[PDB]
Design a protein around this ligand. Structure first.
Ligand SMILES: *[C@@H]1O[C@H](CO)[C@@H](O[C@@H]2O[C@H](CO)[C@@H](O[C@@H]3O[C@H](CO[C@H]4O[C@H](CO)[C@@H](O)[C@H](O)[C@@H]4O)[C@@H](O)[C@H](O[C@H]4O[C@H](CO)[C@@H](O)[C@H](O)[C@@H]4O)[C@@H]3O)[C@H](O)[C@H]2NC(C)=O)[C@H](O)[C@H]1NC(C)=O
Ligand SMILES: *[C@@H]1O[C@H](CO)[C@@H](O[C@@H]2O[C@H](CO)[C@@H](O[C@@H]3O[C@H](CO[C@H]4O[C@H](CO)[C@@H](O)[C@H](O)[C@@H]4O)[C@@H](O)[C@H](O[C@H]4O[C@H](CO)[C@@H](O)[C@H](O)[C@@H]4O)[C@@H]3O)[C@H](O)[C@H]2NC(C)=O)[C@H](O)[C@H]1NC(C)=O
Ligand SMILES: *[C@@H]1O[C@H](CO)[C@@H](O[C@@H]2O[C@H](CO)[C@@H](O)[C@H](O)[C@H]2NC(C)=O)[C@H](O)[C@H]1NC(C)=O
Ligand SMILES: *[C@@H]1O[C@H](CO)[C@@H](O[C@@H]2O[C@H](CO)[C@@H](O)[C@H](O)[C@H]2NC(C)=O)[C@H](O)[C@H]1NC(C)=O
Ligand SMILES: *[C@@H]1O[C@H](CO[C@@H]2O[C@@H](C)[C@@H](O)[C@@H](O)[C@@H]2O)[C@@H](O)[C@H](O)[C@H]1NC(C)=O
Ligand SMILES: *[C@@H]1O[C@H](CO[C@@H]2O[C@@H](C)[C@@H](O)[C@@H](O)[C@@H]2O)[C@@H](O)[C@H](O)[C@H]1NC(C)=O
Ligand code: NAG
Ligand code: NAG
Ligand code: NAG
Ligand code: NAG
Ligand code: NAG
Ligand code: NAG
Ligand code: MAN
Ligand code: MAN
Lengths: 487, 487
C-alpha cells in the first residue's frame, strides 16, 4: 500500500505501571529493505526542535530520562511496533511520535500520534440525573494497558446495596483495553450526600490507587416542618412555617381558596400575619411542588375574638296589650353565649349562638323601663342597651286621698300614663260660690311616667265635700271618687 | 283876727239831692264894712282864667249852668257863708272856692277850698280779713249832706244774719255829716261767694240808689275729696286724689313715715305710682295745712302680689336613721297658704303663713326621690323643688334567684345602695376547675339607686351548686344565698 500508520490517539496508565502502545505501520511495499530501523520521538514531531529519543533500533543510546525505562516488542519487519514503557513518572507524560528508517532518504516521521497520560486516579461514571424512584447504575473504569501487571478492583463505601458486578477488559476508544466494574442499586431519599469510592491494587506491589464520587439523588419533596391546627387572637402575630425536603429546589406556595399570597422557592417559607381578622380565619394550604413530585399539607387557623358590640332591631315603642319582637344580633368568632335582662328580672338566655330573639305576649305597664343585651364569651364580653317605653291608657293610683284640715280642705290624686294626661277635678259644691275664698285652687307636676296632682278648696267646713278625679290622653279616660282620712 | 276861712276839704252827695257846704270866714276885724258882698267860684282859683260864677251877693246873673241851681243861706255879716246847691248833675262836680268882697282893693279869694263829688253809689266798708271762726261787722256809709231830703237805708241780700243796727248822722271828716248803717253777724264756710247790698231812698221821690260788695271769708281747709282704703296689684297704676276746700290756698302735702314726696299748693293734688312694690305698701297721709287751720286725712294701700319664688335651706343629703329639717321660705304680701309634697304622697300643709318647716323623724330608703314646695295664693302661685337623696347601707332585693338551664347554670342578684356597691359572688365549687369552661363569668349594671348583677357558671350539670351574693359600700355589707326556680 501507501505510507501511513495506525496508532491509538489516547492511552493512559498509572504510576509505576508499564504501558503497551499498540502500533502498526505501512510503507510502499515496492521497497523491501532487509534491515528496518525505527525511532520513538517524545514531545516533538520535527527533528529540527530536538526531542528526547525514547527508542532506537540497534542503539542503546537514548535520552537519559528514558534510560532503562523502555523496550520494543516484536520485529519491525513484520510491521509491528508496539512499545512497552515500564515504571512511569509524570515527566514521561507527553505526546509520542513514531519515525521510520528504511533505506536512505526514505525516512518518515508519521503524522498520526499517541498521547501518554499519567493518572493516579480511576474514572467513575454516574448518570446525569438520579431519581429516588428509579434504578441506577454507576461504573468504575480503570485503564489496564499492562499485560504483566493485571490490576484488580475494589468498591469502598459500598454499604451493601447489592453485589458488585465485574467485567474483563473492554475495547475502549481505538484498540485500547480497560477493566470496568459496574454497580447496580436503587437509592432512597437519604442517598444524597453519600460518598462512593473505587480502589485498585496489584499482587506483588505496595501500589494502591483510589478515586471518589459523591451522589446527587433527586427526591420528591415530602413536607416535614409543618405545625398543626392553631387558634390565635385577632391583632396578634401569626407565624406559619412551611418546610420541604427535596434535593431539587422545591417550589413552595402559600395558598387559600385560590390566592397567590407569597410564592417562593426555598427549603422553608415563612408566612406572617398581623391584625388578624375574621376574614383571615379558616384553612391555609402549603404546596411543595417539584418536577420530580409534589406534596400538599394544610392547616386550620381559628381566630378567637371577643363578640362584636351587639345591635338590636325590631319594634321599640308599641301599645298596651300588643305583641313585641326584639331581635338582638352579634357576630362572634367563637360560639358566643348571650342573655337579655330587665333591671331586677332576667328574660331570655341563648346558649352558643349568633343571635337571640325575645317575644313579649302582652305588655303590662311594668314592661316599660330599660333593658340590657349582653354577649358573653370566653375571651371577652360586650353589651348594648334599649329602652322599652310603652303607651298607656291612664291609671289613677290608689295612693290618692282627701285630707281635711279644720280650717281648709285638701286633696291629692296621682295617675300614670305614657303621653301627658290632661287632668281635671269634678266636685259637688252646694249653691254657687265664685270669687269667695279661692278661685285659683289646684296644682300639678310630672316625673317620668307619673303625673301627680293636688287640689285645695279653701274655707270649707268639715262638712265633707265629695271629690272626683279624671284623666284623659289620646288613648283612655278614667274617673274616681277619693276618700277621707283626716278628722 | 287875721284873714282866713274854714271849709271842709271834701264833700259828697247823690244825683238830684241838694248839698249844704259848711262855710265860715274871718277878715281883719279892724274894718267893719256895713255891706259885705261875696262870690262862689267854680273849678278855678284865679279870676284870670275865667271860672263859672256859682253865686254873687245882690246879683241874679250867674253862670247858665248854675242858673236856678244854687242859693246862699244866712247873712255874710254874721260870718256865715254855708251854701245850698239843689238838684245836682255830674257837670257840677268840681272844686269850689269862696272869694270875699268887702270895701275896695280888699277883695280876697281864700286859698282853702272844698271839692264836690257826685256819686250815685253808697260806700260799704268790710274788714281786710274775714275768718270763718270770728265775729264780723260790715258798714254802709251814705253821705247825708242835705237837711231837707233826709235819706233812709235798706239792706239787700241780708238773708237773716241778725238784725241791722242803725245810727243817726255821724261827724265824718271835717264837719261833714253821714248816715251810717252797720251789720253784725258770724259767717260759715259758705259765706264766701256771697253778695251783700245796700239801698238808699227818699219819701216823695222816684230816686233810688244802690251799692254792692262780695264777701271773702277765710275758712280752714276741710278735706272732702278723699278716697278710702284700697288694694292694688304690683306694677299696676295707682292714682291717689287729695282735695281740700279752703278759700286761702291750702298747702297740700303727700307724706309717709316722714318723707317729702310731692308737696304742692292747690285745691287738688294727684299722687301717681307705677311699678308698685312691697316697699310702697302701707299708709299714706295727706295733710291740708293753712294759716287759718289744718286737717290731716290718711289712706291704706295694700299691695296684693303673688308669692315670691320660694327658697329652701336646711339639710339635703343625710344618713339613714337620722333626723332631717327642711325649711321653706316665701315672701308674699297677702297671707299665702303653702304645702310641700312627695311624688304620690303629701307631707306638710301650712295655712296663711310666711314660711313652712318639715321635719323627718327617721329616713326610710323611700324618703329618697324629689320633693316639691308650692306657695299657693289668691292672685297667683309659684313653686320650687328639691331632691332628697339619702345614703343607704346596701339592701339585696328578693327579686334575686338562680335559674338552672340544663346545659348551663345562671343567677341574678340585685341590690340598692346610695354609693356604688362593690359587689361579689361566693360559691362552693367542688375540686378546683380553672380555665375549664369559662373564666370571665359575671356582668353588672346600675340605674339610679339600683345595682343589678348577673352570674353565669358554664358546663355545670343540674347538680345544684349553691350560690351566695355579697355587697359592700362605705356604710354596710350584706350576704345572701339564692334559691332555685328552674328545673
Ligand atoms: C506485536 O507483537 C506483540 C508481541 O510481540 C503483540 O502483543 C502481545 O505482547 C504481549 C507481551 O506482553 C503478549 O502477552 C503474553 O501472553 C503470553 C500468553 O499468550 C496468551 O494468548 C494465547 C493465545 O494463543 C493463549 O493460548 C495463552 O494461554 C495466553 O493467554 C504469556 O505467556 C505472557 O504472560 C506471562 O506473564 C504474566 C505475568 O507477567 C502471567 O500472567 C502469564 O500467565 C504468563 O506467565 C505475556 O503476557 C501477547 O500474547 C501479545 N499478543 C499477541 C496477539 O501476540 C501484538 O499483538 C503484535 N501486534 C501487531 C500489530 O502485530
Ligand atoms: C249858718 O246859718 C245856717 C242857717 O242859715 C246854719 O245851717 C242850718 O240851716 C238849715 C237850713 O236847711 C237849718 O235846718 C232847718 O231846721 C229847722 C229846725 O231846726 C232844728 O233845730 C232846733 C234847735 O234849736 C230844734 O229845736 C228844732 O226842732 C229843729 O230840729 C227846720 O224847721 C227845717 O226843716 C223843715 O223842713 C224839713 C223838710 O224840708 C222837715 O224835716 C222839718 O221838720 C222842718 O219842717 C230846716 O231843716 C238848720 O237849723 C241850720 N242850723 C243851725 C245851727 O242854725 C249854719 O249852722 C250856720 N253856720 C254858721 C257857721 O254860722
Ligand atoms: C332611656 O331612659 C333614660 C332615663 O331612664 C334616658 O335618659 C337618661 O337619664 C339620665 C338620668 O338618670 C341622664 O343622666 C342621662 O343623661 C339621660 N340620657 C341621655 C342620653 O340623655 C335615656 O336617654 C333613654 N334612652 C333611650 C335610647 O331611650
Ligand atoms: C333630681 O333628680 C333628677 C333625676 O331624678 C336629676 O336629673 C334630671 O334627670 C332627667 C331624667 O329624666 C334629665 O332629663 C334632666 O336633664 C336631669 N336634670 C338635670 C338638671 O340635669 C336632677 O338633676 C336632680 N336635681 C337635683 C337638684 O339634685
Ligand atoms: C335587622 O334586620 C333587618 C332585616 O330583616 C331581617 O332580614 C330579612 C331578610 C328577614 O329575614 C327578616 O325576617 C329579618 O328580620 C334590617 O333591615 C335591619 O337593618 C336590621 N337591624 C339591625 C339592628 O341589624
Ligand atoms: C336659711 O336661713 C339661714 C339662717 O338661719 C336662720 O336664721 C338664723 C338667725 C336662725 O334664726 C336660724 O334658726 C334660722 O334657720 C341662712 O344662713 C341661709 O342663707 C338661709 N337659706 C335660704 C335658702 O334662705
Ligand atoms: C507474585 O508474582 C508471581 C509472578 O512471578 C505470581 O505468580 C504470584 O502469585 C505473586 N504473589 C504475590 C503474593 O503477589
Ligand atoms: C404549631 O402548633 C403547635 C400546637 O400543637 C404549637 O405548639 C406550635 O408552637 C405551632 N408552631 C407554629 C410555628 O405556629
Ligand atoms: C394533593 O395531594 C394529593 C395526594 O393525596 C393529590 O391527590 C392532589 O391532587 C394534590 N392536590 C394538589 C392541588 O396538588
Ligand atoms: C212828702 O213830703 C212832705 C213834706 O212836705 C212830708 O210831710 C210827707 O210825709 C211826704 N210824703 C211822702 C208820701 O213822701
Ligand atoms: C277709692 O276707693 C274706692 C273704694 O271704696 C274706689 O271705688 C275708688 O275708685 C277709689 N278712688 C281713687 C281715686 O282711688
Ligand atoms: C292731725 O289732726 C289732729 C286732729 O284730730 C291733730 O291732733 C294732729 O296734731 C294733726 N297732726 C298733724 C301732723 O298735723
Ligand atoms: C508515501 O509517500 C507519497 C505521499 O504522497 C506517495 O508516493 C505514497 O503515498 C507513498 O506510500
Ligand atoms: C290878711 O292879709 C295879710 C296877710 O299877711 C295880714 O296883714 C293879715 O293876716 C290880714 O288879716
Amino acid at each position: 500500500g501507501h505510507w501511513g500508520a495506525w496508532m491509538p490517539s489516547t492511552i493512559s496508565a498509572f504510576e509505576g505501571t508499564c504501558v503497551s502502545i499498540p502500533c502498526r505501520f505501512d510503507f510502499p511495499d515496492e521497497l523491501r529493505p532487509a534491515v528496518v530501523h525505527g525511532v520513538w520521538y517524545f514531545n516533538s514531531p520535527y527533528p529540527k526542535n530536538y526531542p528526547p529519543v525514547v527508542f532506537k533500533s540497534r542503539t542503546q543510546v537514548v535520552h537519559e530520562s528514558f534510560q532503562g525505562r523502555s523496550r520494543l516488542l516484536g520485529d519491525l519487519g513484520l510491521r509491528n511496533c508496539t512499545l512497552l514503557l515500564s515504571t512511569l513518572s509524570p515527566e514521561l507524560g507527553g505526546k509520542y511520535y513514531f519515525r521510520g528508517d528504511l533505506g536512505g532518504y526514505n525516512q518518515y516521521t508519521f503524522s498520526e500520534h499517541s498521547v501518554l497520560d499519567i493518572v493516579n486516579t480511576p474514572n467513575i461514571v454516574v448518570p446525569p440525573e438520579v431519581v429516588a424512584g428509579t434504578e441506577v447504575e454507576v461504573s468504575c473504569m480503570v485503564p489496564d494497558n499492562c499485560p504483566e501487571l493485571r490490576p484488580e478492583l475494589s468498591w469502598l463505601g459500598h454499604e451493601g446495596l447489592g453485589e458488585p458486578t465485574v467485567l474483563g477488559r473492554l475495547r475502549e476508544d481505538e484498540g485500547t483495553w480497560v477493566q470496568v466494574s459496574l454497580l447496580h442499586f436503587v437509592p432512597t431519599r437519604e442517598a444524597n450526600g453519600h460518598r462512593l469510592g473505587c480502589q485498585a491494587a496489584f499482587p506483588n506491589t505496595t501500589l494502591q490507587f483510589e478515586g471518589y464520587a459523591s451522589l446527587d439523588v433527586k427526591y420528591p419533596p415530602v413536607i416535614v416542618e409543618m405545625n398543626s391546627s392553631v387558634e390565635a387572637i385577632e391583632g396578634s402575630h401569626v407565624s406559619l412555617l412551611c418546610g420541604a425536603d427535596s434535593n431539587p429546589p422545591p417550589l413552595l406556595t402559600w395558598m387559600r381558596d385560590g390566592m397567590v399570597l407569597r410564592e417562593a422557592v426555598a427549603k422553608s417559607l415563612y408566612l406572617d400575619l398581623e391584625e388578624v381578622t375574621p376574614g383571615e380565619d379558616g384553612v391555609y394550604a402549603c404546596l411543595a411542588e417539584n418536577a420530580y413530585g409534589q406534596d400538599n399539607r394544610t392547616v386550620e387557623l381559628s381566630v378567637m375574638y371577643a363578640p362584636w358590640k351587639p345591635t338590636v332591631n325590631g319594634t321599640v315603642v308599641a301599645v298596651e296589650g300588643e305583641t313585641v319582637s326584639i331581635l338582638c344580633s352579634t357576630q362572634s368568632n367563637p360560639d358566643p353565649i348571650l342573655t337579655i335582662f330587665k333591671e331586677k328580672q332576667i328574660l331570655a338566655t341563648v346558649i352558643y349562638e349568633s343571635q337571640l330573639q325575645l317575644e313579649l305576649p302582652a305588655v303590662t305597664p311594668e314592661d316599660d323601663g330599660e333593658y340590657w343585651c349582653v354577649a358573653e364569651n370566653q375571651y371577652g364580653q360586650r353589651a348594648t342597651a334599649f329602652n322599652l317605653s310603652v303607651e298607656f291608657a291612664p291609671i289613677i293610683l290608689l295612693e290618692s286621698h282627701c285630707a281635711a284640715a279644720r280650717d281648709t280642705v285638701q286633696c291629692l290624686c296621682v295617675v300614670k300614663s305614657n303621653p301627658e294626661p290632661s287632668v281635671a277635678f269634678e266636685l259637688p259644691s252646694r249653691n254657687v260660690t265664685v270669687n269667695e275664698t279661692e278661685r285659683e285652687f289646684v296644682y300639678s307636676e310630672r316625673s317620668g311616667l307619673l303625673l301627680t296632682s293636688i287640689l285645695t278648696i279653701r274655707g270649707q267646713a268639715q262638712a265633707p265635700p265629695r271629690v272626683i278625679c279624671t284623666s284623659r290622653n289620646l288613648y283612655g279616660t278614667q274617673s274616681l271618687e277619693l276618700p277621707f282620712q283626716g278628722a
